[model samples]
Target: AKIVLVLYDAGKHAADEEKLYGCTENKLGIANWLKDQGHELITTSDEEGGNSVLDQHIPDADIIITTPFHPAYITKERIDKAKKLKLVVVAGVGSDHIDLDYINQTGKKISVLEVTGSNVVSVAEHVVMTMLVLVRNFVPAHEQIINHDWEVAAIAKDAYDIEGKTIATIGAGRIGYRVLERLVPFNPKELLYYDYQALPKDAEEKVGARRVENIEELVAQADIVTVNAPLHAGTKGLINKELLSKFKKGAWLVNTARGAICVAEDVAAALESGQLRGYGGDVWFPQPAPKDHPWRDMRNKYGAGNAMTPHYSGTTLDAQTRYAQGTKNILESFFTGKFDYRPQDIILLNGEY
Candidate 1:
């Protein structure tokens, strides 16, 4: 069987930190394990362009595995060409890279699985960090020291405490729920959530979260809004110019969720206009966002409001270990012919979504 693993390249870090399992070099620590079973394991970080390694390997791949951090987008055309493909494993969460509509178009249902809950805590923690980074205005404070120019007022003017702020989460699922729990100690003015389904009474009581039935209310009320909703038809471009206009002026936003959920151009414009005091997260629409992506440099007139990074909120070294282990465990199940995948992990099964 041929297995193609697409992960980000760690360069020196693969050797510097031997436990960096998500890197192309580490191969999720499954290279030897799969090789001993007489399976072919090919790993690479070259998934860009028409003639990329992923395209070259797709035609013969039996199981293709990729991480959300460095997704090798499996388009409809690639799916059409991969005659031998059987399964796809998302090393971390989010299967947004694959064109699921095209997957359902075929007679056969291609199995897709991810390690559910694997990176929840990692991302949830990052969500909190991003919020603080923005609300407390940490970037310029740290930048001042690096530039050997200490102007406390320049940063302190924008800094504010997270306490007594109305913090709202767009989706209160595993990651969002955890974020809410983590925020409890901060003594927020209120914890509100807006989701398709509301949390049970006990769950809401645990976090002191109130369910907002609509996004308008959520944005209007929040001093800080954290996005945790998954990207889909319902949420694609959900936070566009219209929604951005509704946010409390100078509200901070942290989106560790899918990038497409928020309109890129609108977000940048919002920052420039000071509709948002700061925006911080590590999720981008196109993984490995182009160097020219506006979010890279977008900022408020004061010059400190963008916090976008590569899509890696969920790919911390600790998260890599969990997802890597989850990947190996999923493969063992597939290899044994039991196909006993955890219900939560199976994105597609028995020809149904």
Candidate 2:
């Protein structure tokens, strides 16, 4: 009778399930389906203190389902305690919150998987949008209108056109390549990318993007940089203060990647020092960035150029529907005994599970 424990912070899935085994804490669309099967679905958004509602019931959970949107940071410590846990399902793409190395080393039969391609388009589109917004200094310009001020000159001072700019993406993975492909029609002055592996020559020609041998070189040449890399050992805080200072002055940066890729304070410094024209993106370190998160208050001396959001690039309502359905599909497969984990969804299933 062990059930899945859903720990959502923003009340994503709330109501649907049979024995509190597969129900959502916010959106319960599939609760009835799981309930009809007589499985229990326990859910809660109260993961705050040591005795959180989730903490009280987690020890009995056989499966843990969470989204990158509001990750239930499945630490090795927690995993060690959850002796019955087996499967760790990521409702969305990106499973860095879970300690895959620990899972693998522990020899836990726990399979970590995600719904690949579910939000590539969503995130790719957002990255492009954010890149343009930062490059054009669009947010402050619009803010001037909202504040009922006629300060076109003030905002236009920092604004720059996206066309004729050298654009680059740090990681040329699914989302990264999609972004490059989308930007092709823009006819940027130059399109560049940096990744561990190069794309097929034919694919590169079609996208009109040149692959750089070194990440530093790519960042240096980019007038507008968009980060789409995964967060791994070598990449955490990859775009630090020292490296960021090498970028083209007044350059724009858009990171729909992980927040940890860039040092928060360094980014603020870059913006303030005019090294970065503007910075905008939809990802933050702690899923729900704290009120005092520096990114929220960062501003240039004149209060002119920076924009940030609470990390919603991937989980749009549309994306939520797709991933949610995909999550259900994966779960159903597990219950029906025909569960075959998608190859692409496996980040490190072998020893890095």
Candidate 3:
């Protein structure tokens, strides 16, 4: 069987050189193991465009491994071309890049799997850090020193304490609950959440969070909102101009979740008009946001509010170790014909999602 691993290139990073798994160059050190088993292992960072290395090799691949940070974007078009494909493995969580419905409709027996819970804590910690950065106006303060300027008043003009502010999260899943749990110590005025299903009573009590049936109502009352919802048909562009307008003016928004959940143009406009006090996150719609991506330069009236980073929140060194080992375990089971994957890791099986 042939396996193709597409991952991000970590240029000149010694950490990536450790072959801790999921980096483009090393293929998580799985190459030697796969070769020992008499299988073909191809690893590359060239995943963009139709003529890229991924598209060229995918048609012959039996298994494809990708990551959330730099997804191969297995669209229906690619799926149609990949006649020999039997399995797709996500080295990390979140499989939004794949077209799940098309796979099911095709009835081609392609299974999808991911390393569940591998980066929940890492992402949750990032959520809290981003919230604090935006609330405290940390970026502008740091930039002042770099530029050799002393402008305390300029930074302080927009900076505010997070305490006593209403903070709400869009989804109450593992990452979302962890975010709320971490935020509770700050003594926010209220902790709220809006999910399709209400969180269990015990879980709600643990975080001291209240559930809001209406999403608009939750955002309207929140001083800060963080989105943790997964990307799907229902959640695509969930936070557009209409929903953003309902937010309490000057409210900060953090999205460590998928970037497609929010409309990029709308977010830039909101920040420009001061509709949002600040916007911070590490995920972007496209894996590598282009040079002209609007969020890169968009800012508030004070000229410093956007805190966007490349998609690295969930790929920290600690997270890489957990997910890399998880990937190896899955592959081991598959090769041994056990197919005994962890239940939580299977997103789609036998053409059924």
Q: Evaluated with lDDT, which candidate comes out highest? A: 1
TM-score against native, each model: 0.94, 0.90, 0.93
Name the runs in model 1 displaced over 4 angstroms: 48-51
What value of lDDT does candidate 1 attain over all alpha carbons?
A: 0.90
Q: Give Cα distance to truth, residue 311, candidate 3, Å.
A: 1.4
Give the least accurate 10-residue stretch of model 3, judged by summed lDDT: 12-21
The alpha-carbon deviation from the true structure for residue 171 of candidate 3, after best TM-score superposition, in angstroms, is 1.1
- Ranking of predictions according to lDDT: 1, 3, 2
- Highest TM-score, which number? 1
Write one digit per residue (lDDT tens) for candidate 3, span 203-256.
999989999998899999999999999887878999899999999999899999
Instruction: For candidate 3, give the lDDT of residue 287.
Output: 55
lDDT: worst 10-residue window of model 1: 100-109
Instruction: Return the lDDT, model 2, position 261.
Output: 90
Clashing pairs in 1: none
**Which of the two, 2 or 3, has more TM-score?**
3
Name the weakest run of 10 consecutive residues (lDDT summed) in model 2: 14-23
* lDDT-superior candidate, 1 or 2: 1
